[PDB]
């Protein structure tokens, strides 16, 4: 567990989980290959009835629909658009009272933990084909090597 790192932008090295620790509901982080994937994760607090919320994604205000029917778990939602003028679309969610999410660049992909703790797992990915894909995090984060995926899984499901 290398960190915390302060919010920043980076060419996230391949084969590291970026375990992100946001402070509260809102945008958490964005990333892109600049070609055909612009992705973002947002965090929704417990007890949110279906609604639109405004996020600044790719520099622009976007109204996205969110909900969280848990009274204890936060919900991370992973949104992806495929072109600059496209639509950010929900692909995956992670429900967790421990407030942590993680993604990793590996195998020409970005892997992402999804499901509901305490058996969330790294079962979603998108294809990026760009090992220099850039990530900008508004939150503190940690780096965990892929060799220690089992530990990242432990932290996702139980906190630090
Ligand atoms: C958004 C993105 O980059 N998608 C890739 C991705 O899509 C896969 C992947 O998300 C896995 C994760 O478990 O789930 C599916 O296999 C998904 O496949 C895509 O979506 C489904 C609904 C089908 O329409 C399928 O034909 C489609 O490929 O990886 C694939 C390669 O496996 C592509 O690279 C997508 O663009």
From Swiss-Prot:
UniProt subcellular location:
Virion
> To which species is this protein native?
Rotavirus A (strain RVA/Human/Japan/K8/1977/G1P3A[9])
Sequence segments annotated as region (Spike head): 1-160
What is this protein called in UniProt? Outer capsid protein VP8*
Q: What does this protein do?
A: Forms the head of the spikes and mediates the recognition of specific host cell surface glycans. It is the viral hemagglutinin and an important target of neutralizing antibodies. In sialic acid-dependent strains, VP8* binds to host cell sialic acid, most probably a ganglioside, providing the initial contact. In some other strains, VP8* mediates the attachment to histo-blood group antigens (HBGAs) for viral entry.
Q: Which domain of life is it from?
A: Viruses
- Tell me where the transmembrane regions lie: none
